[PDB]
Amino acid sequence: SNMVKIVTVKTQAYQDQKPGTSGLRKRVKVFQSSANYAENFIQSIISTVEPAQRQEATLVVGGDGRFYMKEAIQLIARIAAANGIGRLVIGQNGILSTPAVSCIIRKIKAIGGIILTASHNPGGPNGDFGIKFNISNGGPAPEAITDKIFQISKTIEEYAVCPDLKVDLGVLGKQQFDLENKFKPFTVEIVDSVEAYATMLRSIFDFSALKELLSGPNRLKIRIDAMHGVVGPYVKKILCEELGAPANSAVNCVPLEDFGGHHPDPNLTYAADLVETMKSGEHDFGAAFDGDGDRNMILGKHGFFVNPSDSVAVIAANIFSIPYFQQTGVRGFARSMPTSGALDRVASATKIALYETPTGWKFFGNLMDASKLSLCGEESFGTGSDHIREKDGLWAVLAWLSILATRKQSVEDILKDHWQKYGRNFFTRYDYEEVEAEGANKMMKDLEALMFDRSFVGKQFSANDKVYTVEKADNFEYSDPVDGSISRNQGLRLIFTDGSRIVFRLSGTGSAGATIQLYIDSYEKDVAKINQDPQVMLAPLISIALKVSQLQERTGRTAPTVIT
């Protein structure tokens, strides 16, 4: 073996291989039962690399450990070898977290990477599978490249593969493959899954201070729940082995091919195990990650919930607790439009630009590539920095520990102080899942028409205590300052004069069933308001949102499916 033949396989294209912004996800059975589905797509990706540049190109390959990953990596290798790709760098056992791929691409100046993950979607023999393509800055492929891959996938007529090539994913080092009658070899470098990423965090944070925090007398007690996904080994090797947290800090930190039969999705119910652990009051800090590691939930003592919109605000407000930002400075803050305005209060107090983007990474990456963005957040458990071009779940955790280490206060006390300083943006997201598509569209269209009337600005809404006055109402548009793209229809906003907002979106992917996402952001500054139950303080704006949108009338829903 190890000298292998190159073969050409005649194939028949499928028409549904759209790469999207977060990858091609299909049921695993689809990859398995649809002949050459994966081979075709892997070939389409490689055809976007100019033939003349392939020998000097490196692709980074790894994934989140879910069922079918290793088979796909073998398939990526067999096809990369046959197409003349010079080198793959593959994490051991195929394991690379998504922030780790971003780290490695940028570090070694790779042309890009292929990440085998479906993020928070279930995995296993009956679960989902995903294939994600990243380009040379370590981030998601932009629309121009994903368009080309899609166009190729629909009309591909043959692909190249080395059918007898097999990579040993389990042993570190360089494996070389000689291709029959090809002059130059194919090289695979298997790297430790954690090292390059850990070395990055070691530069970014003060691991000494963290070691003192987590070790010893009066240590901060933490529980870090990787939800049986990719971040497990990162937790064990970084938080436990290097930084000295007791071994019990690492919860569900063995990657499982089915994520233990659960959704590796961090929130209070999918991560019920972590929350209940935290409820005992014995530990100071808890966190959960998603399957591929770019999302994070932060919990405090007794299970105190730091909502993601508040989290980026606390980091922003204490950002120089982190050595990285001490060196680079803070170039800007950003959030997606539906994320709460907690970050804005800080960006205004610290006089830093606040960028409000449509949902989606591309907008942050552009701003980061322009050196105009240091810290970004999304209401969906996302926090990141410009250290890479993906969001970074464990990075956010190590950021919190830096602030806890510097502040020497509890998580809950830090949040109360923040609310005392900046006011609190009470925030919740209502999901209405699988609603009939026709009604939702009429709901959005009618609401947009209502808001578009000249008299709507200035309309007053009574609450049962306060009056909310409409300051601005539109359908969100964004002119991207880097690539010049204009993103239109990004969400109906009801902006009130007191700093509160209601935002409606109808969810994109509404093909299995539409989703209405209603976000409520109620700002309060008075001390007699800042420590009450959020769902109580949010009730008036919820009432106003449902009345003005007539959500119940258009859909028959008396309640959202999920509340976060």
Contacting positions for Co ion (CB under 5 A):
119, 290, 292, 294
How far is 112 from 117, CA to CA, in rounded Å? 16
For Co ion, the closer of residues 119 and 339 by Cβ is 119
Give counts: helices (H), strands (E), the chain. Answer: 20, 28
CB 114 within 8 A of CB 64: no
Would you say 561 is a known binding-site residue? no
For Co ion, the closer of residues 86 and 266 by Cβ is 266
Would you say 294 is a known binding-site residue? yes
For Co ion, the closer of residues 290 and 524 by Cβ is 290
For Co ion, the closer of residues 119 and 515 by Cβ is 119
Backbone angles phi, psi at 447, to 5 degrees: -60, -45
* Alpha carbon distances (Å) from 273 to 225, 251, 277, 314, 509: 9, 9, 6, 25, 30
Would you say 359 is a known binding-site residue? yes
Considering the complex, what minimum distance in angstroms separates the CB of residue 266 from Co ion? 10
Considering the complex, what minimum distance in angstroms separates the CB of residue 47 from Co ion? 27
Q: Which tokens sit at 518?
A: 């209603």
Considering the complex, what minimum distance in angstroms separates the CB of residue 219 from Co ion? 30
Would you say 526 is a known binding-site residue? no
CB 189 within 8 A of CB 80: no
Nearest to Co ion by Cβ — which residue?
119
Return the amino acid letter for 523. Y
Helices (H), 194-249: 195-204, 207-214, 232-234
b/e code 290-300 from CB counts within 10 Å (16+ = b): bbbbbbbbbbb
Q: Which tokens sit at 320?
A: 């120089």
Give SS3 for 159: strand
Would you say 488 is a known binding-site residue? no
How far is 471 from 454, CA to CA, in rounded Å? 12
Considering the complex, what minimum distance in angstroms separates the CB of residue 22 from Co ion? 8
CB burial of residue 9 (10 Å; 0-12, 13-18, 19+): middle
Helices (H), 190-264: 195-204, 207-214, 232-234
For Co ion, the closer of residues 308 and 540 by Cβ is 308
Q: Which of 403, 393, 390, 385 is nearest to 206 (CA)?
A: 403
For Co ion, the closer of residues 284 and 292 by Cβ is 292
Just list the catalytic residues: 119
Would you say 25 is a known binding-site residue? yes
Considering the complex, what minimum distance in angstroms separates the CB of residue 223 from Co ion? 21
How far is 296 from 382, CA to CA, in rounded Å? 6
Would you say 431 is a known binding-site residue? no
Considering the complex, what minimum distance in angstroms separates the CB of residue 528 from Co ion? 39
Would you say 119 is a known binding-site residue? yes
For Co ion, the closer of residues 99 and 332 by Cβ is 99
Would you say 466 is a known binding-site residue? no
β pairing state of 87-95 and 186-191: parallel
Q: Which tokens sit at 407?
A: 């502040």
For Co ion, the closer of residues 290 and 392 by Cβ is 290
DSSP 140: B
How far is 197 from 188, CA to CA, in rounded Å? 19
Give SS3 for 118: coil
b/e code 49-59 from CB counts within 10 Å (16+ = b): beeeebeebbb
For Co ion, the closer of residues 380 and 425 by Cβ is 380
Considering the complex, what minimum distance in angstroms separates the CB of residue 119 from Co ion? 3
Considering the complex, what minimum distance in angstroms separates the CB of residue 391 from Co ion? 8
Residues sharing a CB contact under 8 Å with residue 445, sequence separation 6 or more, in sequence order: none
Give SS3 for 371: coil
Q: Long-range contacts made by residues 344-347, C-beta under 8 angstroms, separation at least 24?
A: 345/313, 345/422, 345/423, 345/425, 346/313, 346/316, 346/317, 346/422, 347/316
Would you say 290 is a known binding-site residue? yes
Which residues fall in the annotated binding site? 25, 119, 290, 292, 294-295, 359, 378, 380, 391
Which residues fall in the annotated binding site for alpha-D-glucose 1,6-bisphosphate? 25, 119, 294-295, 359, 378, 380, 391
Which residues fall in the annotated binding site for Mg(2+)? 119, 290, 292, 294
